Structure formats: C-alpha cells, structure tokens
Amino acid sequence: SEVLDGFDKVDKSLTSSIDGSDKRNNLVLSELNTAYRTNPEKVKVWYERSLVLQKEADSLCTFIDDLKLAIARESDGKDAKVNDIRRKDNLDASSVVMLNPINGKGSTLRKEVDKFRELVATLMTDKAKLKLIEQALNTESGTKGKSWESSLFENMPTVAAITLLTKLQSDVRYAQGEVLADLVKSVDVGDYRVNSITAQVIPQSQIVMSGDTYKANIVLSSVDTTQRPDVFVNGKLLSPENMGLFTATAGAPGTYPVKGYIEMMGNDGVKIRRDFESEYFVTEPMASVAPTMMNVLYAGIDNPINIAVPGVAQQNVSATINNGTLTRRGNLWIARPTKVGSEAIISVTAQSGGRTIQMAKTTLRVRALPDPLPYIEYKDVQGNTKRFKGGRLGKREILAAGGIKAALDDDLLEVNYTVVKFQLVFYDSMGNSIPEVSDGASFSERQKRQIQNLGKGKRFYVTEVIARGPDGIERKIPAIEVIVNLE
Amino acid sequence: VSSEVLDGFDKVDKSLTSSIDGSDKRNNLVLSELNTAYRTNPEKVKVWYERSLVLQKEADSLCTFIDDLKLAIARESDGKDADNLDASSVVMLNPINGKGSTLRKEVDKFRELVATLMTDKAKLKLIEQALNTESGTKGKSWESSLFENMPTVAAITLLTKLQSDVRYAQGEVLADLVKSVDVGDYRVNSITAQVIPQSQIVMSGDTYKANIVLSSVDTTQRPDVFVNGKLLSPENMGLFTATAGAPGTYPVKGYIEMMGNDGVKIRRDFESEYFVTEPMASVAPTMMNVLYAGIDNPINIAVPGVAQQNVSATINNGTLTRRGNLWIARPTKVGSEAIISVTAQSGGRTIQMAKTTLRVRALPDPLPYIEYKDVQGNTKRFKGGRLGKREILAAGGIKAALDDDLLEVNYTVVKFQLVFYDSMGNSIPEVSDGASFSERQKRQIQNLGKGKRFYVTEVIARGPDGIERKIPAIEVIVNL
C-alpha cells in the first residue's frame, strides 16, 4: 500500500522536476528568438538547430507519455490515471507492453533514444568533451546479456516502470537544455573577448647618448588573442601568418611612415574599422674610420672639416676649437690654427631638441704648410699643359713660360703658391758664373737674352728661389737645372 | 517489500546516482573553465570565481549531509533486521533528534544562497527556488510529509533525488556565473588601433618591428604610471622622460594602474631597459682622405659600444688587416678610389655600416739635403746656398728625407751627380758612389776656389714603397 506511496512520491518529484526543466528550456529558446529578431545572418543556423532539437525532444517525450498511458491502461483499464495506480502489477503490464514479441515497444523506444542521441551528436558543436557526458546520460546498455529494455522492464512493477520512463523523460529534457545552452554559447564564439591586458613601454629610442633624453610612452593594451583582424598597412595587407606584426627593414636614412587601418568583423555582423597612423625614423651608424695620419691641420690655410652626428641634422651640430678659428660654411666647418707644433682640440656639441649634448672631444695635430716645388709650366704645340721639374726643355718653351712657377707635388685643389724671387745662373765661355736676378716671379731681360743666346745643349740653373704661400711666410724652394734642346 | 519492488527502487536509486555522478563532472569542468579564465584575466573574474567556490563549498556540505542521512537510515534498518518499518521515521521524525528539520533548514540555507548568487534570468532562479521548496500538505510538515509512512529504499531514493536536484541547481548557478563573466563588457569602451613598436628610432640595415592591434583604451580616466620609485605626474599622460647620465644599462621598472569599469583596479607590472652609449664625434678633414700606397697605412676603426673584437672591414683597393687595436691598409691601385665597408657585430646580428671613401696616392718625393754639423755642435740640413769646403766633405754625401715630419717612413739616396764647370764653360759631371761622394768628387771639391759653385743634380733616391724617384737639385756655393 504505502510502499507504492513512496514510489509515487518519487514519481511526483520527477514530474515536478520535468515541469521545471521543460519551462526552463523555453526561456533559453525565447532568448534565441529575441536574438534572431536582431541579427539573423548566422543566428538563423543556431535557431533552426534549436527548433529541430525541440521537435525531436518533444517527439520522444510524447512517445514516452503515450507509453506511460499504455502501461497504466494495461493494469486497470481504459479509464485509469498515470499517477496513483492501484496495488502493484509487478509482472502484468510493464513486461507485456515493452517485451511482447508481436508489438514490441522496447526496441522502438530504444531506437528512438538512439536517434535522439545521434542527433545530439550532430547538433552540439563545441564542448565535445561534454558530448560524452550527454551520451552517457542516454546510455544504451543494460546488464550482462539483457538488452536495454530487458533489464528495465522484465519483472518490474507498473509504477516502478512509470518512474523509470519519467526519469528517461527528465534525462531527455536535461540533455536538450544542455544542447540549447551549447547553441546559445556558440552564437558568441569570436565576439571580441578580452583575454590578456598587459602594460607595455614603447620607447622612442632604445639607445640614447649621455646628455640626451630617453622618451618612453607607457600604455596598456586589452587585445584579444582569439580574433585575427585584417591589418592593412602602407598600402598592402599584412600577411595573416604574422599575427599582426609589421616588419620592415630599415633602408636609406629618413622618416618612413606607417599608416593604415584595422578592419575586424564585429560581433553584430558588421565590420568595424579603425585607422591608425604613425612614424618610424631611421639613421645610419658610426664609422670612426680615420687613418692615423688624418689628424693634421695646416696653419694659415683653411682646413675643411666634416663633422657629423647620427640623427642630428646639419644645423644643430655646433663645434668649437681652442687653437685657432672654427667656422661653419654650409655643411662643412673650416679650421684655421695658430700655434704650429702644438695640438688642437675640437669640442663638438649637438642639440637634440632642447638640451645640449657635449660630444667626445678630438685632438688633432697642427703642422705648417709644406714647401712647394718650382716648375716651368710648358705646353707643346699640341695644346696640353705639362709641368717641368728640371731636365731637358726647348728654348721656345722656356721663353714662352715667362717665368718660374711654384706648386705642390700632389696638387689637387687645396693650396696655390706664388714666387717672389729667383736667380738664373749661366756659365760663359771662360767658366765664369753669371747669376742674373729676375723681375720677381717673371724672367728679366738679361735672363731672356742669355736664354736666347744659349747653345743647343747648354745648362742653366734656376737657383735661390723664394716663393710665397697663403700663410703669409716666404720659403726657399729647391733649385732646378735646365738643358736647352731643339723641338 | 517483494524482491521485485526492491529491485525497482534500487534501479531508480542507481539511475539517479548515475545522474548525480554525471552532473558532478559537468560542474567540475565548468569550475576548471572558470579557473583558467581567472588565470588569464583575473581582475574581471575574481568575484564570480570566488562565488563558484562558495557554491561548491556549500553545495557539497549538503550532499555529504544527505549521504550521512542515507547511511543513518540504512543503519537503522540493519539494526532492526538484526520491508516497511520506521527507518525514515526514527531518523527523520525522532522528537529527540530528528534530522528532517535540520535537513530542510540546510535546504533553505542553500536555496537562499542560490537566490543570492543567481543574477541574470531571475526566472531561472525562481525555478531553482521551486526545486528546493519547503512546504507540506494539510497540516503536516515538509519532512513529516516526505518521511511518515515510507520504507527504507523509498526514503533513500528520495534523498538521492534531492541530491540530484541540488547538483543540477549548482550546475545552473555555475552557468549563470559564467554568463556574468562573459558579459563584463569592454566593447562599449571605445576601441582604437595601436602600433606598439620595439624601437621607433632604428639604424639603417636593421629592421623595425611593431605589433598592430586593437586595444580598448579608456581615455576617461587618469591612470597612475608608477615608474622607478616615483609616480609620474598626472599631466604627463604616461610619458617617461629621464636624461641619460653615466653611460651603461638603466632600468625602467614599475607598474600601471587604472580604475576598471566594474570597480576593480586593474594593475599591470612592467620592466624594461634603455642603454646609454657614449657621445660620438665624426670629425674628419677632407684634405686628409688619403691612403699612401706601397707602405702600411695605420687606420683606427672605432664603433660606439662595440669593442674591436667584433668589427670587420674590407677594401676593394688592396689589403686591410689587423695589428692590435688598429687596422692596417695597403692599397695597390694608385690614383683610384678605395671604399672601406665596415661591419659590426652586436647581440646576434651583423650590421653593415657606412662605406667610407678614401683617395690613394703615391708616397711624396722627398727633398735632398746635406746633413752638416756646424763647428758649434748642432746639426742642420743644408738645402742650397753657401757652405764651407769642410762641412761638405765631413757630411759624407747627399741625404734625402721629407721636409715635414710624417717620418714613419724615411728615404735613402742611391745615386747623384756633381756638375762642376771647367775653365772653358763646359760641364764636368761626376757620378756618386751611392749616397757618398766619389773619390773624384772629393778631389774636385778640394780643388775649388772661393765663390765657385757646384750643383748636386740627378738625385735618384729609393723609397720605402719600393719605387725610386728623381728628387730636385741643389746649388752649393763653396766658401772658405
């Protein structure tokens, strides 16, 4: 009597839980409906799968409702309830309904459960780890050789079988609720989650010089490690295999820009884009490649120096000097020392923005101007000019040069000298030395007459030549010997 | 109770136990998901993860209580056997100690906790509140209605059903606590594209690295950027600026902190470093861009912050090797140019630097001189003019050297001539015995009256570069 009251109380608890869970799943389905009315571009698929789930779950549950009614009717009669059945048919109805080899219903219920389980396998996308739990919740395996319907409805009372069928309905409801929750969570897969929030230090220059200023912008970023947006940068699209990492090799010096935009598929179906624009500077590094014989400055003449600092422009490098004068002139400096035989330091100072960096000092040497060499600038009849540093020359070329010039050996364009005095020594027909002086830098008249009267092959000597340099001091340059020829 | 009804009760018991053990794993899995999300971004998950912990605490201390109740009912039934008896009546309704009232008090406590934790979908909470109802029929208590006249296995299966309900309720509350974490929205905060570079100022030949991302920056606040012991003033917009002092490696250590939207201060630590090298001065005259051929030109290559053990340079014109802390260049193509391409090696990279262009010439021809020690004790270099007829022969002969003092190299005379002039106008040339005066030269110097001249002419002197040159001549006026 009351032993069945306990079982029917268990059945009442199961039915109340089924009512609760079945009304609960409707709320999630209603949330899916409201979300369908908003952005039905991909919510359509989840809504349709949820509708199919509802169809199949309600089909199986109505099947089990009719099975409970058929088990209850196989006890008392057609007019019998499904809750408080009288007495206990511990052999009569539960086995005859679910095991009759003619109208076998156990196999049919088992195959319907199998259909629902495989449908769940097809509907639940993510949480495949939980798909195994949902499958175990609908296990199709009895005990030993007895089939699934066998052990459950072999020698079972009628209420003891109605309770099992109600528990099967409850399991179907819980499974469909979990699958509906899975679909709702799958509607929001790549919807811009916040995962890593880090603090970063963006430095202007990772390497600074003593006296300069370190500049670092310290910012936070709340980026998503899941979504992969399209990052168009400097015209072309960045390869998605870079995970958003613009790489550009620093070419020629300058200020290369980095401008573009990020386009990301938003969670509401529309694409959102944000434009960005920044700059990255490039410099070229130090080559202190100085042969140990460069450090010489000549006193008097303007020495052109090239002072350069990496990154700092040409109008910010400002250098001084202690021994002489250092003056800018376009892009080059010009040095004029004073004390010959002593060193000279050049203090370099740059200015990076609003602060004066004092660069490393450099000590050079100072040496007077070298002595030039005298020559007879002669050109043959074919036009091209040559210099004559002693030897054999024609009377015509000797007279055409007008005088004795003076220039450096490795001439180039540096310095230009001039002569102030020189003598010409001849030897007459008695061994006497006739030293005739010249009109400064040009030949005299006695000299030109001697040269006109010199026989083919005789020697005359340009001696005691005093020349002048731009440093304002006169110097004695070596003598030369000339032999008259005929050409 | 017949054995078949007992079998049915125990079958329902085992099926409900299977449901419990499944919905238990499906809850520990959600707790693990929450724990991983808390490992990732903890600031927005602390509250809900701690609430899930509170739930697992207070939901397991109730299932353990119901397990104890089942064990006590079984103990009473076994003590009676040592059917349909008072197994659930002496345990749940004993006026001395009846655990039914305590059970429903614990159920009300857990239900109030579930009501406290469930935030969104309060109808779902109202549903959970119905699965844990404490109400009875007619004038009986809840436990009095659930355990009055019911056998052992019926009461045990009902308690197992209560455990199953508690487990499913816990799972639903966990799902709610997941939704609340996921809807901690940061997308209502405006998103901007950020270019985060490794270094904004790079060198040529290197590379510029910069991640390009979308960050949810919140310009509505004034964040605290604590940097190196002292906080940055709020009007700096988080911009660390320090003048570089002594050269070396200086750190940039600290944190940033800003008040989140949900009231939890998000703080993130950072530690970077900036290197201070030495000031560079590239001073170089353009007139001195010369590498004399033949000989060994000493060059010194210096690079900031890189010792000479890593620098490597080459040259198209000839050879360039090392001789300690400096290189030595040896060009072999006169007149043309010579470019030196330098290569440095810092941390895991080979930097190609500036190609320095230089001009190559030949060693300048020296000047000849007669090195004479005057009778006063000094040493001078006669180069034309008057000289005595003893300081000449005492010198030995003609020497030659650079008038300047770039005297890392020195020259040697190999041949010269003395050109006397006879008493008839013709010239008398006498060759030399190397760099010293020949015997005939000494004799004809000894036979020279005052005021007479002789000329050192055709002075071939050998150089350290190999080639020999013809250097100028010098006039000597013999006097007494």
Side-chain angles (χ1 to χ4, degrees), chain B residues 423-444:
Chain B
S423 304
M424 282 173 282
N426 298 124
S427 62
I428 305 300
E430 295 293 335
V431 303
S432 58
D433 192 81
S436 297
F437 292 150
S438 173
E439 187 62 35
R440 297 191 53 84
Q441 291 184 348
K442 295 183 185 178
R443 299 195 193 280
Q444 294 185 346

Side-chain angles (χ1 to χ4, degrees), chain B residues 44 48 51 117 119-120 175-184:
Chain B
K44 76 167 186 175
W48 314 101
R51 291 181 186 189
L117 300 183
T119 49
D120 285 324
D176 172 284
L177 295 182
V178 170
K179 289 183 189 177
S180 293
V181 176
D182 289 357
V183 79

Side-chain angles (χ1 to χ4, degrees), chain A residues 9 197 210 250-251 283 288 292 481, chain B residues 145 204-206 245 268 298 300 457:
Chain A
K9 278 181 177 174
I197 299 182
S210 185
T283 67
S288 181
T292 67
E481 160 177 335
Chain B
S145 180
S204 187
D206 200 337
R268 284 300 197 263
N300 213 324
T457 287

Side-chain angles (χ1 to χ4, degrees), chain A residues 201-206 214-217, chain B residues 197-201 272:
Chain A
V201 191
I202 288 85
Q204 167 185 276
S205 182
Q206 205 166 356
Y214 177 59
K215 298 180 182 296
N217 201 36
Chain B
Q198 178 180 6
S199 181
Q200 188 172 341
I201 303 177
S272 183

Side-chain angles (χ1 to χ4, degrees), chain B residues 437-471:
Chain B
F437 292 150
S438 173
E439 187 62 35
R440 297 191 53 84
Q441 291 184 348
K442 295 183 185 178
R443 299 195 193 280
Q444 294 185 346
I445 283 184
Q446 205 77 225
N447 287 350
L448 281 179
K450 209 173 186 180
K452 303 186 60 56
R453 300 172 167 84
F454 72 89
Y455 309 127
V456 179
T457 287
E458 186 191 312
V459 193
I460 299 181
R462 193 173 180 271
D465 55 356
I467 67 176
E468 63 189 20
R469 317 123 167 82
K470 186 171 297 183
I471 65 183

Side-chain angles (χ1 to χ4, degrees), chain A residues 317-384:
Chain A
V317 279
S318 55
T320 68
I321 202 175
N322 69 329
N323 189 280
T325 298
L326 189 58
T327 57
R328 196 189 301 272
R329 194 157 298 145
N331 283 21
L332 279 66
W333 296 74
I334 293 290
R336 295 175 50 85
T338 59
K339 173 67 188 305
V340 50
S342 182
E343 295 87 15
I345 55 182
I346 295 182
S347 304
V348 181
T349 62
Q351 288 188 339
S352 181
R355 192 166 274 93
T356 302
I357 310 172
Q358 290 183 351
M359 299 303 179
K361 291 185 178 182
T362 303
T363 305
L364 314 174
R365 302 192 307 267
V366 176
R367 184 173 48 79
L369 277 181
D371 291 6
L373 299 185
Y375 70 102
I376 300 182
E377 184 189 15
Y378 80 100
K379 54 167 64 178
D380 47 1
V381 74
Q382 65 200 1
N384 60 330

Side-chain angles (χ1 to χ4, degrees), chain A residues 18-288:
Chain A
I18 288 185
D19 188 14
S21 56
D22 211 6
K23 292 169 58 182
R24 180 188 311 175
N25 309 143
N26 166 81
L27 290 148
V28 196
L29 183 46
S30 178
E31 199 284 329
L32 268 192
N33 188 89
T34 60
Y36 172 81
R37 303 210 220 100
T38 300
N39 183 26
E41 177 57 37
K42 204 165 187 175
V43 187
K44 280 179 177 168
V45 183
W46 321 112
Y47 200 8
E48 293 171 7
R49 292 183 172 182
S50 171
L51 295 174
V52 169
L53 181 69
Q54 180 191 45
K55 290 178 184 177
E56 302 299 326
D58 289 354
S59 176
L60 182 54
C61 293
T62 302
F63 203 5
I64 304 184
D65 268 353
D66 294 4
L67 258 57
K68 292 167 57 181
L69 191 63
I71 290 185
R73 286 182 181 176
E74 194 55 40
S75 303
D76 315 332
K78 299 304 177 183
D79 45 328
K81 300 186 185 177
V82 194
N83 201 208
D84 51 2
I85 302 300
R86 187 178 56 87
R87 278 204 183 184
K88 246 168 179 164
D89 265 352
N90 55 337
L91 282 182
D92 247 5
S94 62
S95 307
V96 168
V97 173
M98 305 298 294
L99 290 183
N100 212 22
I102 306 304
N103 51 267
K105 255 48 191 173
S107 297
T108 308
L109 178 60
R110 177 172 58 90
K111 290 185 176 299
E112 291 288 314
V113 172
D114 298 355
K115 268 199 172 186
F116 183 79
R117 181 167 35 86
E118 301 170 359
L119 172 80
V120 170
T122 66
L123 253 50
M124 183 135 177
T125 165
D126 201 3
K127 285 188 299 179
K129 180 67 188 63
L130 197 142
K131 195 187 306 176
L132 276 73
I133 308 299
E134 289 181 358
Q135 289 179 357
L137 223 63
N138 295 322
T139 170
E140 182 242 350
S141 57
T143 60
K144 290 296 299 180
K146 300 179 181 179
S147 298
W148 182 77
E149 64 279 346
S150 300
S151 63
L152 266 59
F153 314 96
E154 188 166 349
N155 293 334
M156 290 285 299
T158 35
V159 173
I162 292 184
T163 300
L164 289 174
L165 293 179
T166 311
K167 200 259 179 297
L168 185 53
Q169 291 176 350
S170 177
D171 294 337
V172 174
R173 298 302 186 181
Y174 281 137
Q176 81 158 346
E178 295 299 329
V179 175
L180 189 45
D182 180 74
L183 293 184
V184 171
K185 292 182 180 180
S186 69
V187 182
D188 305 328
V189 174
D191 284 10
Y192 186 73
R193 300 304 181 188
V194 175
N195 291 325
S196 67
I197 299 182
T198 56
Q200 290 172 333
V201 191
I202 288 85
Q204 167 185 276
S205 182
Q206 205 166 356
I207 292 178
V208 291
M209 298 181 300
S210 185
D212 203 322
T213 50
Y214 177 59
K215 298 180 182 296
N217 201 36
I218 318 192
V219 310
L220 301 89
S221 62
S222 308
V223 312
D224 192 17
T225 48
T226 296
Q227 296 202 182
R228 301 293 185 267
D230 287 332
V231 180
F232 290 91
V233 297
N234 287 11
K236 294 303 297 178
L237 173 61
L238 179 137
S239 59
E241 294 172 327
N242 294 14
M243 298 300 180
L245 179 60
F246 174 75
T247 50
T249 53
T255 63
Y256 299 101
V258 174
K259 188 173 70 72
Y261 70 101
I262 308 185
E263 207 169 3
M264 176 181 62
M265 183 70 64
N267 44 23
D268 50 349
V270 301
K271 299 184 301 177
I272 57 175
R273 57 185 302 272
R274 300 294 189 267
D275 296 21
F276 63 92
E277 177 177 354
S278 184
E279 53 182 5
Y280 77 96
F281 305 148
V282 293
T283 67
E284 55 180 6
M286 175 184 212
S288 181

Side-chain angles (χ1 to χ4, degrees), chain A residues 260-262 274-277, chain B residues 191-195 212-215:
Chain A
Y261 70 101
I262 308 185
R274 300 294 189 267
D275 296 21
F276 63 92
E277 177 177 354
Chain B
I191 310 171
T192 61
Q194 274 189 350
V195 172
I212 311 172
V213 291
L214 312 110
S215 66

